[PDB]
Structures are given as C-alpha cells and as structure tokens.
Curated annotation (Swiss-Prot), chain A:
Subcellular localization: Plastid, Chloroplast
Gene knockout outcome: Slight reduction in rosette size and fresh weight and increased starch content in leaves.
One GO BP: starch catabolic process
Keywords: Carbohydrate metabolism, Chloroplast, Hydrolase, Plastid, Protein phosphatase, Transit peptide
Protein function: Starch granule-associated phosphoglucan phosphatase involved in the control of starch accumulation. Participates in the regulation of the initial steps of starch degradation at the granule surface. May release a different set of phosphate groups from those removed by DSP4.
GO cellular component: chloroplast; chloroplast starch grain; chloroplast stroma; starch grain
Section covered of the full-length record: 72 to 280 of 591
Domain of life: Eukaryota
GO molecular function: carbohydrate phosphatase activity; phosphoprotein phosphatase activity
Protein name (Swiss-Prot/TrEMBL): Phosphoglucan phosphatase LSF1, chloroplastic
Coiled-coil features, chain-numbered ranges: none
Swiss-Prot record, chain B:
Highest taxon of the lineage: Eukaryota
Compartments where located: Plastid, Chloroplast
Binding-site list for substrate: D42, H82, D90, K287, H292, T334, N373, A374, R400
Residue numbers of the full-length protein present here: 106 to 539 of 575
Protein EC: 3.2.1.2
Comment on pH dependence: Optimum pH is 6-8.
Protein's recorded name: Beta-amylase 1, chloroplastic
Active site per database record: E174 (proton donor), E372 (proton acceptor)
Curated annotation (Swiss-Prot), chain D:
Source organism per UniProt: Arabidopsis thaliana (Mouse-ear cress)
Active-site residues, record numbering mapped to chain: H178
Family named by the database record: Belongs to the LDH/MDH superfamily. MDH type 1 family.
Enzyme category, top tier: oxidoreductase
Protein name per the record: Malate dehydrogenase, chloroplastic
Function, in words: Catalyzes a reversible NAD-dependent dehydrogenase reaction involved in central metabolism and redox homeostasis between organelle compartments. Plays a key role in the metabolism of dark chloroplasts and non-green plastids. Essential for embryo viability. Plays an essential role in heterotrophic metabolism in embryos, and autotrophic metabolism in photosynthetic tissues as well.
Cell membrane is among the record's keywords: no
Record's catalysed reaction(s): (S)-malate + NAD(+) = oxaloacetate + NADH + H(+)
Tissues where this protein is expressed: Expressed in rosette leaves. Expressed in meristematic regions of roots and shoots, cotyledons, young leaves, trichomes, stamen, pollen, tapetum, gynoecium and ovules.
Length: 191, 422, 315, 316
C-alpha cells in the first residue's frame, strides 16, 4: 500500500541536509556532492524521512521530531537504514532555489518560549516518565518544540535546517544531473 | 465494429523517412477501398528522440500521418517507448535513443532485472520510474515530453485523423514486466517467466513494503523457488496448485506488491497522458498482455510473473479495469482469434476463458474494450472466432500488414471479415 | 494568549526575573506589575521584548485598584528583604501587612482568581490571606495557593545530583510547608524508580529543608533566592495557566487549604482545574515509612504553631 | 547540546537574568560565571534549578584562567552603570579598562570562543577587543561579535505594535552601531514586506534609536535596560550555539569587523556557521531608500569617531 516509500542503507557520512518544517515532517533539503546519498540516486530532495536506524542497523524506529534524528546525526560511523516517502506530487525545488534560507523560516523574529510542559518540548527534552515535565526550557528557535508547541505559539515554513559533520567539503546541491533541464521539465509538466 | 490494420515495423526507416512510399500507397489504397476503418502506427522513441534529449525529428512520421489523412484513414498512434529487433531472427531493429542507452550502461539498474541478474534493455524499469536518471529527467518526464512534442506537432490532426493513442508502458507496448525474454532464446513457449523486479531501485520499495507490513524478512529479495522461465508451474513449489507459496501470506504479499507496482506505473503514465491529451477529441488506450497459456492451472504462473495477480481466488484484471475506468482508458487485449484446441493442451492454454474473464472485468468496471490478434492469420476460422468475440469491442487491430495479405485468397478472406465485422 | 497574570511587588529582587519569565510565555496575554516604585522602569525594560504579551505598570493603591481589575492569576512576591540587625518579628509584621493590604485589594477588585502567595513565610501568610478573604466575604478555598514549588525544584535538583539519574526525568514530591523543618521530601515515593539509602535520606532531607539559608549564606546575608524563586514561581504560574486552559494533568505540590488532616492548610500534590483546587490526592500520605511519620509529627506541630501565629496576626 | 558558555561579569543588572536565561536553555551543558564579587551567591541561586546545565562560579583573576578553559561561547556584559553626576569620559574609561582586561585574559585561554561583547559602548568596545586579539595573533574576525540583537528585538516589537503585524513573522534588520545615532533600522527590508509611510518611518526609526535613553529615563537613577539586554543576549547565545551545532538557517545581526564599508567595524546581518561568519549579507546596503542612505551616510562620522576612540584607548 505504501509504495511511495523506499528503504535505503547508507554508510556514514550520510551527506544529507534535513529540513524540519512546521508540519512535523522532516524533508531532505540538500545532498552533498560525491556523498553516499549522492551515489544512491534514489534519494531525491523533498522526500519525507519516515523512519531511521542506528549504527548496527538495530530496529527501524519511526521519527517524530528533531529528537529522534538528533541521536542519528550525533553518531559519525556506521551504516544507517533510512525509510523515505516520495511526495505525492514532485517536490518544487524551485522554491528552494529561489527563496533564501531566511525567507523559509518559521520563527523569523525569534519569539521566546519558556515552558515546563513536556507535551510542548520535542522528543529530546521530554523524559516522558509520569506527567507534564519537570524542568522548563527558554528557547528562541522553534526547533526545540513539538507541533503542538508551534500551534500554541501561533512548501510549509521550515523551523530548522540541520545536518551532521559530513566531511569532504562537498558542495550542497540537488543531485548529480542536469538540474537546469530538470527544472525546465518541471515547469513543462506543471504548465 | 471499427476495423484497424497495423503498419509493419518498417513503416519508417532508421532515418526519419518513409520506407517504400509507393508500396504504402498501394497498401493504403487497397485498405480504404476495402472499407477498413483505420490504421495503427508505432511512433517510436528511438526514431524521434534518437540523439538529442530535446530535438524531436518528425519527418517521416509527419509524411506518413499527413498521408494517411489524405487517404481518409484514422490513425491510432502507439507511443512506443520500447526497443525491438534482433531477438531470435533478424526482422528490423529500432533501438532506444543512444543517450538513453548510454544512461542504461553507466547505471545498469535502469532496466528490468530478473532473479539471476539478466537485464532487459527493451524498456526502462519502473524502479527508477520517478528518478531523474535520463539527462536530468525522470522517465515519466521523458515520456511526457515525447507526448507533448507529438501533440504539438500533430495538433492539426488530433480529433480529425488521429482518434486513439495507445500508451507504450512496457515491452511490446504492453503494461507488463518483460517476463518473456525470447532474446538469445532465454524463454521459449510454453513457459512461465520470471519476476522482473530485481533492480535495487525497486528492491528499495520492496524493503519499504516489508517494513510497513512488519515483516523484515520478506523484502530482502523475491521468491527463492519461483522457477526459471521455461519451467512448468508444477515444477516450482511457488506456483504449484497443491497448496503452493502463491497461496501463502508471503506469496499474497509479494504478488500484491508486484501487481500494485505495475498498476502504479500505469497510474503515473496514464495520468500524464490524460493531462497531455485532455479535451482534444481523442481517446487513450493501454495494451495488456494476452497471457493465454497455463490458464488452467490454479496459480496462473505466467500471469503472476508478468505482473498480473490473477488466480482462481483473485481476479487480477479487475484492479486494472478499475485503473482504466479511473483514467477513462481503453482496455486493449490480444489473443482474440486463437482457440483452446488450437493451442497446445499439455500447457492448459485457455485463450477463450481468458477473453471471457477480460470481458467480465471490463463489464464490471464499465471500461470500453478493444481487441487484437496475437498472431497473423487469414483463416475464416479465426475470422469467425473474432466475429463471435466482438459480438459477445470498440475497435479491432489486425496484425500484420504485409504483401501476403494482398494475395488473392488472403485478400478475399480479409475483406470478407471486414464486411462481416462491419 | 488569553489569560492575565498580575505581580504585586514586581520591582523587587524576585519581581524582575519573575516578570521576565512570565512575559516570555505564550499562555500570557497581559502582565500587570505593581510595586512601591520602579514599576515604570521595569515595565519599560520588559516592553521591548518581542514576546506577544503586553506589559503594564501601576504604583500605589489608586493604580492597584485598576491593576487587579481583570486578573486571572495573582502572584504576590511582595516581601521586604532581611536587614542586617532587623528583628524577625517586626519583619513578619511588615511582610504580613503588605500581604494583608494586597489581599484586601484583590478581594475588593477581582476575588475570582488564583492567588499565589510567595511572600515568606507562606506558612504564616497563606492563613493570613485566607482569613482576610473570609472577613471580606469572598474567600474561595479552591482558588488560593501557596507557592511551594521552589522546594520541589530544589529536591529534584538535589536528588539528581546525589544519584546519577536523568535530571529532567527526576520528580520527587515535598510535603508540609515552606520554611524550616517542615520540608518533607518523599524520596521513597519519588516518581523515577530508585533505591535510596538511609544516609541518602538524611543528606537529602538536611539539604532540601535548609536551602534558603544556604542561598542566604552564599550571598553573605545580602538577600534570599531570587533567580531560582522566580523560576519556580513561573513554573507554578504556567501550571495554573495550563489548568485554566483545561489541562487535565496539572499535578502541582502546592500549599493549600486541605481537609486531609487536622491542619487547616497543608502543602501536598494537588490537581488544578479551571475552578481551582479540583481535587486533593490522599495517597501522598499513604505508604510513608517511620522516618516520614516522625518528621510528619514534628511538621504537624510546626505547622500548627505557624498557622496559629498567622491567625493571631490576621485577626 | 554539550556546549560550554562563560559569562564574565554575571552579577550585575544584566548578568543575573542573563545567567538564568542561558541556564534555562536546551543547548548549554556547562555555564561558567565570573565577576569580581557577588558571583557565588548567584551561582548558588542558579544551581538549585532543575535544569541539566551545570553552573560553576569563579572569583578573581587567578580563577579567571580556569573560567574559560574549553569554553565554546564567551559573553562579556561586565560594566558599571553610570553613577549620579559621573563623568562620561570617566565611565568610558572604566568600561574600556574592564573590556580590555577581560578580552586580554580571554586571548590566552580560548581565542576560538565566539566572543560576545555586551559592555557599552559597543561601537567603542568591539574594536578594543579586536585589537587586543590582534596583538596576540588570534584576532579571527569570524569569532568576535558585538551583540546588537537588542535593537533587532526592539525593532520587531515596535513594528509589530505600530503596524499590527504578527509578532512571530516580523524580522527587521538593523545596521550601523549601538550608540543611538549610529542605529539604522532597515525597515524597508522587513521580511513580512509591508509598506511604510513617511510619517510611519518617522518617529519609528527615532524610537528605535532612542529606546535606550527612554529606558534610562524610565529607570531614573538605576542603570539602563537590563531585562531586555538579558533576553536579547540569551537569544544571541542560542543562535550562536545552534550555528555551532549546524543549523544552516542561522542569520543574526551583529557588530563585526566587516570590510563592507570604509568603516573597519560595522553592524549587519551575517550568517553564522561552525567556524563563525560563514558569509556577510552585503545586500543590506543595496536597494536602500533615500532616508536610509542619508542616515547611513550621517552615521559614518559618528561610528568612525567611536572606533577612533576605541583604537586610541587600545593603543594607549
């Protein structure tokens, strides 16, 4: 049934820049040239990241917010299995090319958020033990909170654009192909 | 019932020029004097986009279709995105565009792969169906651009002379997997075929489906005992009718995966074609493989291998009919003229039962259906079989145009069939 | 942002960080401030932050009547810091006078609101507020609280420091009052599953119940805890705002009037709803060991004395 | 989330709320506090909060060396509020001496420490720090900032209040300096693009310039803005830490040694990455309106005078 989905195994470095948007979905923002994800031509830009694995492969745990991906990106050596979901319609990387990283931001004016409710803190500041949190955090970037926290505060706006310590100093692009022809085909399709 | 005849594979040379132009005058003049409704032409990918990913040469095709318009014959354009030519004999070869072939060579997983790694270059796989692998374009984008160029060039013909566009969605223009590699004699009739889903670009989706279903062992590969192409259904434990793996949970899961990927490939290309050819007085058709042999077996192993999840327990043509009804597409089916007794009985071939099942599915989904013969035959026996199958067909496509059909007795039989169907 | 928080004594040591933390909260829509002076300065300072919660200033009773017009949560940290050579008795008289005046004002302006008494000692100034509200005739026992979460926060910190647990995971409740030997940390009933030892009970108790004096001696008598007190008060305020918003899991260790014991007021884990004291958990006093039992006897004596002193002052 | 932050002078009006806010952060794991006195009390007060960020206190130049050992971000808000009747030049001298001492002690300890300078005047104290880093050969322009985020916060607040705009979306870039007249709010570069009339630009730029004086008048006798400074400095610390954590969306307005103009040091919106100033947004000085260009040209002489005061004091 979930045929838009696909599993890919990548050795570190992953070479993928992820984009946490104000929907809970962790997109793929850019791919480093010459990386393992660059070699694996199936990983596109805008494909949601649904599940992920650990260094030994372990169990293919679902990813809910930045908290799950933090552990994956902290590590530097291993083989990670990633489940990606191709968008129902092709991702308009036209917006990524045109709009600057400041344009596609959720907390542009970094409004402060001090909270003790664990249901508002992302799944790295919860501790999820008995009740609504024990310690409170004062944060300005909306990447430290859940979509419920963002709703309380209030292509979709992105709350963060994160990555890992990918070596090689490869340029962040959108895949190894005639990208100009790809965009021309995209406008031909939509028109 | 409208009658359509198909132009030979030499309708256009390697260069974009009409082959044997005076001969085509002779043939077409005889055809429209015979009262034939129309004619079916293969718009080849490798003769229009041969060397430039953007340049679309339409010389010979423009001559041919304007010429068919001049003789007042409807044109059924078949968007041939497949390679043909030397498989056992010589015939004539129309390869894929050279840049496409170069892309397939640099990345071998762009072509359908079997269990043992043999790669079929007749068509571009559906594992890389939406990946930008063809000079920065996805295969959907390439096919859509080809259809857009065809529409732009022949816009004055759509709705007036061109009345049907069959979409090439697999080998021989049939929405199927290349489970019959007659090349090098890898498969010979009768047989069951293999599972052409061993690209890693599709094994990725296999792993995704296996993880979604909570079975992190059913996505590693395909069946390990499915059987070689020329093996028999009872020779394989997967396709045996006595409680075989096709009835197990793993068999059901894998076969649903296979059929639904083929259906999703169909969905994508059909949606693209409908968007391109919307509201222009033309119809869109999809050709479906007429897998008559091994019909009597419970598993229907050739159908299972060629992407059709049609068994005695599941009707695999009903979802295809649903798709065609969703996109308002014509169901084109082969193997209409053949009879059960004519085909070998040791292989349990049931062409008439298969045609009946197709008709039932099309009636259930209210999908218009068209038929074509599988082999070229001029006999009144086959003509009467086609007449009965049409009586129960929106149109019929006849294979194949050749001077043999213009002989005395063959021509008389053909025209008799024409005014019998009319 | 549809609730109003007022701070009385907002220009003091606790008032400024407390007002800051209250302002940087999306649950707050308007934050009123009151002190004897410096209110205009603190309001001008805070009004430049880009958190969508307005800030207003007030001075004197004439502006206080306007300050408490539509408040939803009242916080009263208005206490005079200890002076070098000033008697604790008259210090209590002064602080109780401030608390009594502010409680009279809130009773006559908007009695239907949560009340968070911070001015030390709450053991004596919570009964004072209750009796003043009784005299005014608008006492609402469900909507009166004594902020005790400072000792809860200190207990969590000290437990996580003593045993190598996850600090954001630790949660231990505190029973009793808010000043002296009345702090009873329920280590044996802490939320994270642990295995304490008797020396750990002794050290944790003597540390948690003697933390205010620790801060005072660290400051060399300059003042009491200000930043931690503001943090704890903001914690309780956001809990109360969540309760006002309909949250069903607001379990806060507060010093409230409870019928679970002979003492009119007790500091226990309570459930807070839109109407205030929605329920009082009894299990906090079930399953205690003999250490908690003896310390609870001494705690009962101390709370009886403190509540009697507060009653004597109020009436 | 294992980054270390030191605050040198964390016992004043700004130091205490700033330390509280930085402790209550998800990124800081270690918090070092320094001041000449009254820092043990604040450290003990903060250590009772139940947040993972550990807190350590240091008193004296001898413990100053241990304070910044392996510190990822340094924040220097140390300063003296103006006493009643105090000489402006004398106050400038004390502030510059404190900044000189703190930066020269930072130099041998951790040059790569994203040095944040708060002590007013920013326009005169940032260049001082830059040259005291120059004499040590560790003057890296990518790792020295003057915190100008308070004016950005004030601009966001004032534009939101005046134009009735969603406070979560408004972002106003401010260039120039941190000395009142050297403030230039590039209102035409407001990210939620909104038209401003002549009268709306007027009184609004000037309140942005004079917010510090307004707060001083409101706080007559007691220093200047301190809660707003703590808030903005905590915002800058969080931005710097998350930039050091990756986060390729970190853009912030800071006062850095920029060759974007003739002035050696300038305030502008820069992109921050793991090594400091990843890039400088030069377009901040392209497309400016007539009023913005006139104000930019007017502030050059004042900013240059402040930088000249700084260089004279540092080379004295």
């Amino acid at each position: 049934m979930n045929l838009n989905e696909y599993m890919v195994t990548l050795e570190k470095p992953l070479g993928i820049r992820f984009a946490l948007s104000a929907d809970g979905k962790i997109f793929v923002h850019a791919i480093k040239k010459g990386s393992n994800a660059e070699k694996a031509r199936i990983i596109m830009v805008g494909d949601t990241l649904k599940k992920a694995s650990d260094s030994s492969g372990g169990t293919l745990v679902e990813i809910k917010d930045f908290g799950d991906t933090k552990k994956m990106l902290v590590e530097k050596t291993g083989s990670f299995s990633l489940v990606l979901e191709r968008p129902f319609s092709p991702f308009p990387i036209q917006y990524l090319l045109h709009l600057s990283d400041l344009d596609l931001l959720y907390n542009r004016g970094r409004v402060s958020f001090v909270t003790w409710n664990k249901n508002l803190l992302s799944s790295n500041l919860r501790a999820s033990s008995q009740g609504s949190g024990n310690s409170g955090y004062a944060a300005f970037s909306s990447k430290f909170f859940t979509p419920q926290g963002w709703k309380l505060l209030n292509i979709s706006p992105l709350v963060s654009v994160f990555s890992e310590d990918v070596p090689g100093d490869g340029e962040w692009g959108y895949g190894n192909f005639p990208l100009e022809e790809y965009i021309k085909a995209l406008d031909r399709s939509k028109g | 019932v409208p009658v359509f005849v198909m132009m030979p594979l030499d309708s256009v040379t390697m260069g974009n020029t009409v082959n044997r132009r005076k001969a085509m005058k002779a043939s077409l003049q005889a055809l429209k004097s015979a009262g034939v409704e129309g004619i079916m032409i293969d718009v080849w990918w490798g003769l229009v986009e041969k060397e430039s990913p953007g340049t679309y040469n339409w010389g010979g095709y423009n001559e041919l279709l304007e010429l068919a318009k001049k003789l007042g014959l409807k044109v059924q354009a078949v968007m041939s995105f497949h390679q043909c030519g030397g498989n056992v004999g010589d015939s004539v070869t129309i390869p894929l565009p050279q840049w496409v072939v170069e892309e397939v060579d640099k990345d071998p997983d762009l072509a359908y792969t079997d269990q043992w790694g043999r790669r079929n270059h007749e068509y571009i796989s559906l594992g890389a169906d939406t990946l930008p692998v063809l000079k920065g374009r996805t295969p959907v984008q390439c096919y859509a651009d080809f259809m857009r160029a065809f529409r732009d060039n022949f816009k004055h013909l759509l709705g007036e002379t061109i009345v049907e566009i069959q979409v090439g969605m697999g080998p021989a223009g049939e929405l199927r997997y290349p489970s019959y590699p007659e090349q090098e004699g890898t498969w010979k009739f009768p047989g069951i075929g293999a599972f052409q889903c061993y690209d890693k670009y599709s094994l990725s989706s296999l792993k995704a489906a296996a993880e979604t279903y909570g079975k992190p062992e059913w996505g590693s590969t395909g069946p390990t005992d499915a059987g070689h192409y020329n093996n028999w259904p009872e020779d394989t434990q997967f396709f045996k009718k006595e409680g075989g793996g096709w009835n197990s949970e793993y068999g059901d899961f894998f076969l649903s995966w296979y059929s639904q990927m083929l259906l999703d490939h169909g969905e994508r290309i059909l949606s693209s074609a409908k968007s391109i050819f919307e509201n222009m007085g033309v119809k869109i058709s999809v050709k479906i493989a007429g897998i008559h042999w091994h019909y009597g077996t419970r598993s229907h192993a050739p159908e299972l291998t060629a992407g059709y999840y049609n068994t005695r327990f599941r009707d695999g043509y009903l979802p295809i009919a649903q798709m065609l009804a969703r996109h308002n597409a014509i169901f084109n089916f082969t193997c209409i003229e053949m009879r059960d007794h004519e085909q070998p009985q040791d292989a349990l071939c049931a062409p008439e039962k298969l045609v009946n099942q197709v008709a039932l599915a099309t009636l259930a989904a209210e999908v218009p259906l068209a038929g074509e013969n599988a082999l070229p035959r001029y006999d009144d026996y086959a003509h009467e079989q086609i007449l009965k199958a049409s009586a129960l067909m929106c149109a019929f496509t006849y294979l194949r145009m050749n001077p043999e059909l213009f002989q005395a007795d063959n021509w008389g039989k053909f025209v008799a069939f024409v005014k019998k169907m009319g | 942002a549809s609730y109003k928080v007022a701070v009385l004594g907002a220009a003091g040591g606790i008032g400024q960080p407390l007002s800051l933390l209250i302002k940087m909260s999306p649950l707050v829509s308007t934050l009123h401030l009151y002190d004897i002076a410096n209110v205009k300065g603190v309001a001008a300072d805070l009004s430049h932050c880009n958190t969508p919660s307005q800030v207003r200033d007030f001075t004197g009773p004439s502006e206080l009547a306007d300050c408490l017009k539509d408040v939803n949560v009242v916080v009263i940290p208005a206490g005079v810091p200890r002076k070098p050579g000033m008697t604790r008795d008259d210090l209590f008289n002064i602080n109780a006078n401030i608390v009594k005046t502010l409680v009279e004002a809130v009773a006559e302006n908007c009695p239907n609101a949560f009340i968070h008494i911070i001015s030390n000692p709450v053991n004596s100034t919570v009964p004072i507020a209750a009796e003043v509200l009784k005299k005014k005739g608008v006492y609402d026992p469900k909507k009166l609280f004594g902020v005790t979460t400072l000792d809860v926060v200190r207990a969590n910190t000290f437990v996580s420091q003593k045993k190598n647990l996850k600090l954001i995971d630790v949660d231990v409740p505190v029973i009793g009052g808010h000043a002296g030997i009345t702090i009873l940390p329920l280590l044996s009933k802490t939320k994270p599953s642990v295995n304490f030892t008797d020396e750990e009970i002794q050290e944790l108790t003597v540390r948690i119940q003697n933390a205010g004096t620790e801060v005072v001696d660290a400051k060399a008598g300059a003042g009491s805890a200000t930043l931690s007190m503001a943090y704890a008060a903001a914690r309780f305020v956001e809990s109360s705002l969540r309760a006002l918003d309909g949250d069903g899991d607001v379990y806060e260790c507060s010093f409230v009037e409870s019928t679970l014991t002979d003492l009119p007021f007790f500091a226990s884990r309570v459930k807070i709803g839109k109407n205030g004291l929605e329920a009082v958990i009894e299990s906090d006093l079930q399953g205690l060991t003999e250490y908690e039992q003896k310390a609870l006897e001494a705690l009962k004596v101390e709370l009886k004395a403190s509540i009697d002193k507060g009653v004597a002052f109020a009436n």
